[PDB]
Paper text:
The proteasome, the primary protease for ubiquitin-dependent proteolysis in eukaryotes, is usually found as a mixture of 30S, 26S, and 20S complexes. The 26S proteasome holoenzyme consists of a 19S regulatory particle (RP; a.k.a. proteasome activator 700), which is responsible for recognizing the ubiquitin signal and unfolding the target protein, and a 20S core particle (CP), which hydrolyzes the unfolded polypeptide into short peptides of varying lengths. Three of the seven β subunits in each of the two β-rings that align this proteolytic chamber (β1, β2, and β5) are proteolytically active, and between them hydrolyze most substrate peptide bonds to generate a variety of short peptide products. We show that 20S proteasomes can degrade the ubiquitin tag along with the conjugated substrate.
In parallel, 26S proteasomes (lacking transiently associated DUBs) and 20S proteasomes were purified from human erythrocytes. Only a trace amount of PA28 (PSME1 and PSME2 subunits) or PA200 (PSME4), no detectable p97/VCP, and virtually no measurable amount of deubiquitinases were observed in our preparations. The specific peptidase activity of the purified 20S proteasome was further activated by SDS, as documented for the latent form of 20S complexes. In order to better understand how a ubiquitin conjugate enters the proteolytic chamber of the 20S complex, we performed cryo-EM single-particle analysis on purified human 20S proteasomes before and after incubation with MonoUb-Cyclin B1-NT. Classification of the data from untreated 20S proteasomes resolved one class of symmetric conformation (further classification did not yield significant differences between classes). Although free 20S complexes are often found in a closed-gate latent state, some proteins with substantial disorderedness are effective in activating their own degradation by gating the 20S42.
Numbering used by the authors:
A (entry chain E): 9 to 241
B (entry chain F): 4 to 236
C (entry chain D): 2 to 233
D (entry chain G): 6 to 244
E (entry chain A): 4 to 242
F (entry chain N): 1 to 212
G (entry chain C): 2 to 248
H (entry chain B): 3 to 231
Amino acid sequence: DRGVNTFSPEGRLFQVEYAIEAIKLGSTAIGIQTSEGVCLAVEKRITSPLMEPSSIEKIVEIDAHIGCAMSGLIADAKTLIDKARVETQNHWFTYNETMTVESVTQAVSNLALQFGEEDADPGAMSRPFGVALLFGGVDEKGPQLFHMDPSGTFVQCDARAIGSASEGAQSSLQEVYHKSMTLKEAIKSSLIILKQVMEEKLNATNIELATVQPGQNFHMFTKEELEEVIKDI
Amino acid sequence: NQYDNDVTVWSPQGRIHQIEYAMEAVKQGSATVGLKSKTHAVLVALKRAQSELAAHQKKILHVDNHIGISIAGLTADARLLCNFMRQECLDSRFVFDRPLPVSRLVSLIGSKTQIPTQRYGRRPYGVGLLIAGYDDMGPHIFQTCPSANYFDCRAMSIGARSQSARTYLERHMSEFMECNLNELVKHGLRALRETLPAEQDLTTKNVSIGIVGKDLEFTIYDDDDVSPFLEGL
Amino acid sequence: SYDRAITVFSPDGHLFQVEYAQEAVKKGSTAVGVRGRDIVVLGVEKKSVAKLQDERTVRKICALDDNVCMAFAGLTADARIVINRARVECQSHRLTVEDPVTVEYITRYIASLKQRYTQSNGRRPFGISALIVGFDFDGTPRLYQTDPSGTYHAWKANAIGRGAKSVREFLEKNYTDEAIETDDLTIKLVIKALLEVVQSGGKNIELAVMRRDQSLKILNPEEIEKYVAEIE
Amino acid sequence: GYDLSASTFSPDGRVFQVEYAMKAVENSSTAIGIRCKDGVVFGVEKLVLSKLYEEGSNKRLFNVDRHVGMAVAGLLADARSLADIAREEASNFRSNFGYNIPLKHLADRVAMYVHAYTLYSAVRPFGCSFMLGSYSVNDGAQLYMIDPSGVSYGYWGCAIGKARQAAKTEIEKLQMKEMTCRDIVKEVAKIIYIVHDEVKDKAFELELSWVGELTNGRHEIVPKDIREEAEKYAKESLK
Amino acid sequence: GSSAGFDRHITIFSPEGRLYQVEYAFKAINQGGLTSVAVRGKDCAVIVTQKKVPDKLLDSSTVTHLFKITENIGCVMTGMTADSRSQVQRARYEAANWKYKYGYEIPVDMLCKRIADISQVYTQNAEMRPLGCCMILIGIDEEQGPQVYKCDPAGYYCGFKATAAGVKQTESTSFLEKKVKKKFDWTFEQTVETAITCLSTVLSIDFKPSEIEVGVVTVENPKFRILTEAEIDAHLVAL
Amino acid sequence: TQNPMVTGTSVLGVKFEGGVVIAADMLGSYGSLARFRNISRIMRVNNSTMLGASGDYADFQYLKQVLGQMVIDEELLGDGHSYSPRAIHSWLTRAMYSRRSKMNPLWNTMVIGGYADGESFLGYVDMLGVAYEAPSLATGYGAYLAQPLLREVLEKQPVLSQTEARDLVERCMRVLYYRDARSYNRFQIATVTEKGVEIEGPLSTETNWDIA
Amino acid sequence: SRRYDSRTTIFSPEGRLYQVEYAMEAIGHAGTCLGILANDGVLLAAERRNIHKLLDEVFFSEKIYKLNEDMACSVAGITSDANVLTNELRLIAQRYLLQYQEPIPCEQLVTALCDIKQAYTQFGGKRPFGVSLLYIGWDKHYGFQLYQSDPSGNYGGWKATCIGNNSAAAVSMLKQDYKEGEMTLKSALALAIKVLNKTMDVSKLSAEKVEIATLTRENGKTVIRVLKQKEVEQLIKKHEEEEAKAE
Amino acid sequence: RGYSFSLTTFSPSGKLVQIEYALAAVAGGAPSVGIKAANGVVLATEKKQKSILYDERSVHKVEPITKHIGLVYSGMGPDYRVLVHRARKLAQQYYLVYQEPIPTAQLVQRVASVMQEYTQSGGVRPFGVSLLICGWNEGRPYLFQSDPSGAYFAWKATAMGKNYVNGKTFLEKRYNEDLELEDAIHTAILTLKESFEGQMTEDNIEVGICNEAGFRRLTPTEVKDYLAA
């Protein structure tokens, strides 16, 4: 009845207005920006017991110093994380330097809102992305945690929760967060809020967590490392 | 009813709803203020809080050394239009080895913003801009709208509840030219303060102030650098 | 060129063309497969044999490479485009990499292809879902499932097509370390699951087993009847 | 649903998207021009919305070439595009044929660019009427006006804006054929104020320009000294 | 008449296959409110149309429906004036490519067929509407002599002994068809009066010298000439 | 331009206090032949800028319509910003460099004089895009036969007057008439000052003395 | 323009393609055509649609359109939409012989067109071909073959099949009288005439309403021969007399 | 830019409506009757002008393609011309490649291929014109009929235009395969007399013939001689 480029009577641009509602159908992802690093925790939402949990990656490697959490449709974010990995290598190739987290999220969010059915290019995107990405990592300015909406608006966040339970999960982050908290307390503070927002039981299988320290690189906790943090919760 | 779905469809009143809905998005944005004296031009912007733990935004972007802008509207469409402004200013210094006049840069925006409006399947740019720059003719406040037309202003405020600021600016608009650099910024602060609810106030974190001048290039002031300017407010 | 958006967002964040593409999957023939130890087994349920068919070209179990094969459920035409373009990638991978394709590689290529036609202009999503089995260079068995939306997941056992909701609940309860032990017991698990979704009875099915030591050889109609008798 | 596209005729053989386009001109402030013996004089009623706008903002008088002026009435966005197109039309002529473009040819090249968008559904007609004028030794003074439909006629004087008919009654009795340019400047300012409405649109700024023999065929905005004398003479006759 | 689906907008087949949309391009010709009369004699061909200046501020020399396609071929247009100038520029460009490619001046025979082929492309494609005007071309062929042809929005260029167009097309055709009875309708240089009386009878105007514009082609003068109002007054005073 | 056809000869220049003056003789050259002697190789760009060129005269007319028309385009909108003599020198250097990259160069060699903001500008643009600014400039064989005379006076007295620089140009143009075969008797002298560019008519070198 | 677009390539709420499902009904009213896989050869029996007496004969056949030296087809559907497909099949078969210097296998040529018939059911916004057409031929590998291709872009192997009008009642008859592996050529000519009777509303077959073409191997060379009117009339008289002795 | 989506789509009951409606425009056209005799083919159509001011020598409803081929139409005037000017181009592209006069059965397949391309490719409507194509090749006469759908049929004798159903049954009775070219001209004229409603004359019809000497349309003088009988 109408095209992909249209403005609402309030100017909401329905296709992105509806793409945000698709995020509320996705799994919950939480992250926290501390001074000693950032943590990224996400619910896997296992559909069936026969589903292999190792094949669900909601947290992927952008660069060695950067990592990202995903939500909503898993497929739509695969093309963005692929352009992010190419963008970070194109920067390291030309400038011989690690690409800052600010320029990564800004380059990926440029792909948002760019779509059209008229003379866009030989290939083109028919619809915006229904995904919400939490970028995180350590840059020359220190640990940073960013968010990317389907509207291409990227915002710096100390702690932010996304997904279906994002409402009511953000209210818990603002209560327990303070600028002086460490990374070990951030990993523990993430699982307690996940325990509230997750429908099924919380164990090492159905949760996916990874952190970025300034000294170390991006690393995801194995099955044996997650069992230690859960026992502390 | 059926005239608002396309930008190329005139209404029986000789009016385009799709362009007016785009001008509704810039009024649903965040309030930004700018004004000029006989010496300096200043941009003052509220950095909007999407949540309590999130670093608000960056609403003032660098275009060239002598030019800077403020954003009210879709943010990804702003930097999409700002990347054209940055490339247009680098084009002049590359070819002509001179700073591109602020009056001519805005003429290039009106020509680019119109093309989506007249063609089928494309949407108007939903971001307004307050362009502050210092040319050989002095400071320039030139405003851009979703409608391709532009306005040369002495003082202007855009975004949500900007009419309360335009009421303040219209009252003191006579004394702006005689103001010094420090006193000139304080007028934009009081104008932008009227755009806030009774329960909110101007702080160092939510306020960014751009300044351009004759012997001073365009520089943005962060939360730490806006403290001397907020000392008199 | 025809440029228009067929798949667009809807109220409450839904994609009609993608959701209706998954409804065409549930209208296709049932394909079931499991992942054993040294063995992986695929099987399908033919709707009507009629004994006028040439059983060779109507097979729903294809071979993407020597170590990788797939069986689908959905519109038959939409599948043949995916198999043909996946076989080109398997050969283009041996050209550049000089190594056989991993099962996860070809699954990501197919999943990224089913995605591309969801967000492309003037192109409808595929109406098929695929079950890919194979063996990596280390010898580990793999089972994956792709959807018209473009999402892929590994599985111990899975079912696609009509009646896959009941077969997936059947496989979930009966899959254990005992049934996946013997190579013959793994074959009997698929047949026991297929007989639940087949209303006609007997064996109208077609089953294919791919081991490691020596590539896939699809079982004849007489060989599948021997296991069907032992499960009676 | 015949009016939803410019490629669809009505049952009576009318194109509404072209007719709705010229209704946007009727919602725009009045701009007039007068062709006299010594040249062409332009004038515009320029409505400033907020007092914050700088004087000279939203300039309604464009120079498409050095000897040709332009005055627009309609959507200001579509007016600036056709100004750039008319500059390119006069640009490509001087490059190819090596001499200044005749305004008979310039008005036709622009009228066919405006008409080209009325035949298709992929584009919309322009919402701005505009006028052209110039002066030359051989060709003399010429004034043409292009409607949103793409039609161009010759005029001794014309009116485009909110009140189209009210200003035509003032120009018809003016007897411009025997009057020089400096006498028309005082008459244009008189017509702008009499057609203005002190009720609906309050604030306005008079924008005047001419082209003729006294500038040696060069279009320019009226100097402040002459413009101040014309505005005072016009308010005296307004009473 | 039965209409189904989108017959009413794009040009496609009605349930009776009438091109429901194309028939409205003929009704758009009457929107101009004018009538053109074309008649050919033995040694000459004549075109006469109504010249109406709605305002006294118009420039009479600029408003004309008679155009010169080439030196030996004239033209008269009836329809939307905006669509008129577009079709004339195509006829001038199509007649110039003929001389450049084929070496000799284009006949009136195949100048109308190429324009009729262009007007068809608008009817078959749904992305564009037909032109709302009809062209009437005259000239002197080498072998065939005088020729009068008219192409329409449907692309029908079929020849004429005499041609009528506009609002009075139906009335002026039946009246002049009774002059198909007298041999050659008295065919010689005074066939100008044949076209004048036909246009003057249906409109009941009794035109003045400046009320109509006339142009002619002859065997002695193959070049197309637009008659001056002083020369029109000579024929108007004789009837 | 792969090979030139009708070429010009050396164009002089010097900057004095208050403005800049250049001179170029009027002659065309095709294969060691004086063919078109009425051609004027000194161009007036706008009020504050003046230009002259040696080399192929056909490529110079192309830079007359491309560069001259760009001045109108800047004067149509009329916001008060005009092209400075060094902004035209920068645009024209970029145009000359973009032609050799496509291997379709412009054969000319150009000297851009101008006076703006109370500062005298004089600049050089070659076929290969080599550009700079010097107090005195001579192209073609003027670098050999003239610039040594320009540098000799400007080394002792860095700043000249309007009359002293004029005698310097007329004395260097006379030397070009003796020892340069492509030279010619009549020559244009154009001067830019605070009053704008003024291009004088033809002047004669006929005051030369031949003692044989 | 989005208002004028009919959305041919979209999905139905039930998971169906409208233009594909509607093209199937155009074939149900199309000309009846069948084929029978036998041991020594394959045949095509197609009921001729226009029997009009003022029609002449042009070239060699009506609905046949022999695609190659070793194989031929038969078309049922939109008459024009079949001509574009046959020209493409003659291009594909010759691009194979040009490239590999070998005759095209029948399984490869059917797959090649079904990719073209599908390309219009997915992208491009055009309408699909309304023609479902059969295939007969011989190759070096599997010998004589018979295929059927629907407008949906999917095909399949068949021992006996029928397309066009009354195809549902014709297949049901072929499910019985046909015997796998036991059918010879002359036995298949009798079975083809038997089906064309009950599946056509005409009281009998006059031999001008049917056209039969057989494909056999003679001296290592595939020959495609359309049975003439005298040869078809002998088959009709054989079945008409044998039907009387069976009752 | 043009529409890339097809305007002709399958109806619910399996039919292409834009082609079915294109046949209605043909059925309301002017009658055109071809007849294939033994030594030649004749094409006779009704050329009727709405008034006496129309010039009959201006446009010709019977136009040749090549020397040995000509064709006539029943339907819209303009949609015939863009079609016939392309048929003249396709025939000469054959002559450039093969240096041979194009066979009639070969030209009809290429023209019917063009009439189909506009029933499928998007943005264009089908033709409203049906053709009667005659030709002389390999010592045999040819008569073909191209429908707006793009399907061609070889006819011995047929008719189109207004009252084609009543006209087609009229040919079946009086047609004979042993007829010559001279006897076939009269039978084509008598069919145009079946539905006329007026007084037919030499300028009221247009007739042309194709024989071993090539295709040519009969001059208005030669047509009058055949109207006496």
